[PDB]
Amino acid sequence: MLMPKKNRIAIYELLFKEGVMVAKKDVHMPKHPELADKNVPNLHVMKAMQSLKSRGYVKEQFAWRHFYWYLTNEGIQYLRDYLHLPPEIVPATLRRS
Amino acid sequence: KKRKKKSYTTPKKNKHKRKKVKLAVLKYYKVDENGKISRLRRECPSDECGAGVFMASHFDRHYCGKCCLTYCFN
Amino acid sequence: VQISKKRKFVADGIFKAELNEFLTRELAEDGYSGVEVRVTPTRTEIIILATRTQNVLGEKGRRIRELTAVVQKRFGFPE
Amino acid sequence: YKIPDWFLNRQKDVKDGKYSQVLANGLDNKLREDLERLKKIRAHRGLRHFWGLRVRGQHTKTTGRRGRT
Amino acid sequence: LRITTRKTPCGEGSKTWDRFQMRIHKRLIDLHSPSEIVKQITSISIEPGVEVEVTIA
Amino acid sequence: GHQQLYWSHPRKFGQGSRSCRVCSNRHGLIRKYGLNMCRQCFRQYAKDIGFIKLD
Amino acid sequence: FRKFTYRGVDLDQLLDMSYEQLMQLYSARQRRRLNRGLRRKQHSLLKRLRKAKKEAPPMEKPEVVKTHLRDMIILPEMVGSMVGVYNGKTFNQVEIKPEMIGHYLGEFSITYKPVKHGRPGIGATH
RNA sequence: AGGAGUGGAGCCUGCGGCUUAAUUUGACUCAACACGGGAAACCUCACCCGGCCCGGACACGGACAGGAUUGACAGAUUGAUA
RNA sequence: AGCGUGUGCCUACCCUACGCCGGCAGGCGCGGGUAACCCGUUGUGAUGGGGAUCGGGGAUUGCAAUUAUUCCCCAUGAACGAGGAAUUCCCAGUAAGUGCGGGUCAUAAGCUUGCGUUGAUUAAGUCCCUGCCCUUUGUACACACCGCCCGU
């Protein structure tokens, strides 16, 4: 934990713009393979991801030292209830159908 | 094989809590009671800090942390 | 940029093994059997074998699109 | 004659920067181990040398029992 | 590419080792042809595993 | 503050900089040819990588 | 009696000169540790040695300092200055001489305590 | 009735006997004993003279602009520019 | 002659050829190598004969090595010529002597896994010891002989 809240809203913007992602456990390092150069410290961002997926309502799947996530519609409802951003802003992921 | 036996010293410690006063009596004061007031800290001439950077006072080496500036006569 | 051919073949085998394990733990309930990669010029086509295919594609390929997205964003291939 | 001076027994020794000559038997053996100064300074290497045991640390518990036979 | 690895996951049993082998074969062929002929003969639905590196030098 | 401690003396043989890429095991690493696994994990996947018992 | 020399030469005059020819008339054992270079956390032992040197009235034993610095001393100017080091579970102090080049601080600790002999029985006595 | 090299004469480590900070997990003969691919400073040490930032989707309690987070050498710390 | 190793998803650590020159790895530049391309055609026996501790020369640059990393020369003399009970392994490119390369990794080995070079005295047998198996036989054993079991 030991997580700030501006990093929280930054990571919530990241989840809103991203949705489906793959993660790798990296905490002590100063340079990540594929999730650096975000102008934000990496450790707090990854702990923010840990909070998201271990708050007790979104399930995980860990193997081959990696995290693949199944973002449930319960998470969509939770984000809408808390941040009050209408789902009418459709995610950009629905192109190249 | 035995235990680690970290028991001989300091059986129990109490947390260090700072009696930080909610009222700025030790920190800043006016000693004038007027719209225009004087400031009890030396003006910083360094341009590597901000324009509202005010340093505290100790027995010497006013310890800012960011710059470690100490007044010396060369 | 360039790695030795022994390392290249070992890494290709690691690619195959981890992809196989990943879609084994994904869609074992789909009757997955095996995964085969096909060598193509400057591209890597992957063909996946399953007993049932209507379920693996589903409706408009939500599962297929999810799998391709995760594999792309995991393996570091060009977009 | 500037001949390479790495053919003498004790080189770069204390008390003389030049290679002085000595002679007589029963005297080289003593000077092959100049243990006086290291004994004086109260060092462990002096008593490493003195007991005839291993100064660099040769292992002696299953091998290396020679030195007194 | 030899790799020898102890068989037993634990450290119990007779000392038994797996000797794994990976044999990599490589062939070179030289010719004189423009690029179009090479890239027309390459796309021939190659059977899997035969990695191709075509160089001009 | 953070930079006052980190990167003081280089760790040129950091053991903790490597782990099994499948199960994150510290011991029995196989770094030869870049497997980077505990030897047990390699045995589990050796046939799938391409390594086979021939001799 | 006259003061005992170090390799037939004095120290103070060579200390006033640079390191260009300092090693031409020195012994080994710190032959290259002098030449290895400098890093952080080295002026600590020199600083506390200077502190104990200045604050001690002359011709008297100084106060005991606590440290574990297994380091090198590039300058033997500290003739008469001594270093005490924590060894085992207590302190230990060692005689100093003008001869500093040729040895290291860590070469004075005795940890190989003699085997506390036992009287094994019950088991394999034969 | 053979033999060669044998553990003894030229390069240390496993684990039990084995004072405290030293004899530190699993393996009770062939099927344990440089075996856990385990070559002990340290990240891997649980025999270790020492400490810290701590762990709660919840069941119960203390109640908000301060209820402290690795973060100063020189009076010191129990090696340590903690 | 090696069998083989050698540099970015990680990653900051890869293998190595001339000059300052005491006598060479080498303290700094200097290029090659994603590798069949570079490393690399890698006088009758303690005397002269094989080293008991241990010291100097420039040290490879690993905080600390001594509380395991780091060269040979002066010939200072050690039962200096087949080894308590108990003994492990081995039948031809055996064994053994050697070095070399990987795994560990900082070119960290005294370990291990492989590789070559030198290289063969003995036996082409038996069930005596240990143990195994294609039989008959005995049993009161079946937790199976480290069994069962008798006697104040």
What residues contact residue G30 under an 8 Å CB cut-off, 6+ apart?
G72, G100, G101, G102, G103, G104
Q: Where are the beta strands (DSSP E) in chain E?
A: 3-6, 17-20
Rounded Cα distance, C19 and C36, in Å = 10
**Radius of gyration in angstroms for the set of CA atoms belonging to chain C, rounded to a whole number:** 14
The subunits that touch chain E, with at least 3 C-beta pairs less than 8 Å apart, are C, F
Query: In angstroms, rounded to a whole number, what is the distance separating the alpha carbons of residues B18 and E14?
Result: 64
Does residue G48 contact residue G67 with C-beta atoms inside 8 Å?
Answer: yes
Resolution in A: 2.9
Q: How many CB atoms lie within 10 A of CB G101?
A: 23
In sequence order, the 6+-apart residues with CB closer than 8 A to the CB of F40 are E9, F25, F28
Task: Count how many domains chain D has.
Answer: 1
Q: Is the distance from CB of C41 to CB of E42 less than 8 angstroms?
A: yes
Torsion angle in degrees (nearest 10) through CA of A28, A31, A36, A40: 60
Domain with G15 in it: 4-123
* Touching, C vs B (3+ Cβ pairs under 8 A): no
Contacts of C17 in chain F (CB under 8 A): 45, 48-49
Angstroms from E34 CA to nearest CA on chain C: 18
A60 interface with C at CB cutoff 8 Å: no
Q: Residue F1, CA: closest nucleotide via C1'?
A: H71
CA dist B41 and B57 (Å) reads 8
The CATH number that applies at residue C35 is 3.30.300.20
Binding site annotation covers F41? yes
* Contact of F30 with E5, CB cutoff 8 Å: yes
Q: Is the CB of A1 under 7 A from strand H?
A: yes
Question: Tokens 């020195």 label which residue?
Answer: G26
CA atom of G98 to C1′ atom of I38, Å? 52
Smallest CA-to-CA distance from C67 within C34, C40, C17, C27 is with C27
User: Does the annotation flag F33 for ligand binding?
Assistant: no
Chain D and chain B touch, per 3+ beta carbon pairs within 8 A? no
Residue found by looking up tokens 């408009």 in the block: C60
What span, in angstroms and rounded, lies between the C-alpha atoms of G23 and G35? 9
Whether F33 contacts E1, CB under 8 Å: yes
Distance from C-alpha of D5 to C-alpha of D17, rounded to nearest angstrom: 13
Report how far residue C52's alpha carbon sits from residue C49's, in angstroms, rounded to the nearest whole number. Answer: 9
**Chains in contact with G, where contact requires at least 3 CB pairs less than 8 Å apart:** D
- CA closest to C1' of I52 belongs to D67
- Is B67:B49 a contact under the CB 8 Å cutoff? yes
Please write down the long-range contacts of E24-31, taking CB distance under 8 Å and 24 or more positions apart: E24/C5, E24/C6, E24/C9, E26/C5
Which of the 15-54 residues on chain D come under 7 Å of nucleic strand H at their beta carbon?
A: none
Which of E1, E26, E48 lies closest to C39 in CB terms? E48
Residue E36 · residue E54 · CB < 8 Å: no
* Residue D2 backbone class (left: φ over 0; alpha: ψ -120 to 50; beta: rest): left
Q: Which of residues 1-55 of F touch strand H (CB under 7 A)?
A: 1-2, 4-5, 14-16, 26-30, 38-39, 42
What whole-number distance in Å separates Cα of residue G84 and Cα of residue G92? 6
Pick F1-55's CATH classification: 3.40.50.300, 3.30.70.270, 3.40.50.150, 4.10.830.10: 4.10.830.10
What angle do the packed helices A6-18 and A73-83 form, to 10 degrees? 130
Instruction: Give the structural domain span for D24.
Output: 5-69
Distance from CA of F12 to the nearest CA of E (A): 26
Token readout for G90 is: 């207590």
Report the number of distinct structural domains present in chain G: 1
C77 residue type, one letter: F
What's the length of chain F? Answer: 55
**Minimum CA–CA partner of C18 in chain F:** F22
Please tell me the total count of domains within chain C: 1
* CA gyration radius, chain B: 21
C30 is in which domain, residue-wise? 1-79
Q: Which nucleotide is at minimal CA–C1' distance from E3?
A: I103
Please list every residue in chain F whose beta carbon sits closer than 8 Å to the beta carbon of residue A65. 19-24
* DSSP state letter for A75: H
CA distance F25 to chain C (A): 17
- Which nucleotide has the shortest C1'-to-CA distance from D63? H12
* Shortest CA distance from F42: residue in chain E: E5
Domains of chain A: 3-97 (1.10.10.10)
What determination technique applies here? cryo-EM
Query: C74: which nucleotide lies closest, measuring CA to C1'?
Result: I9
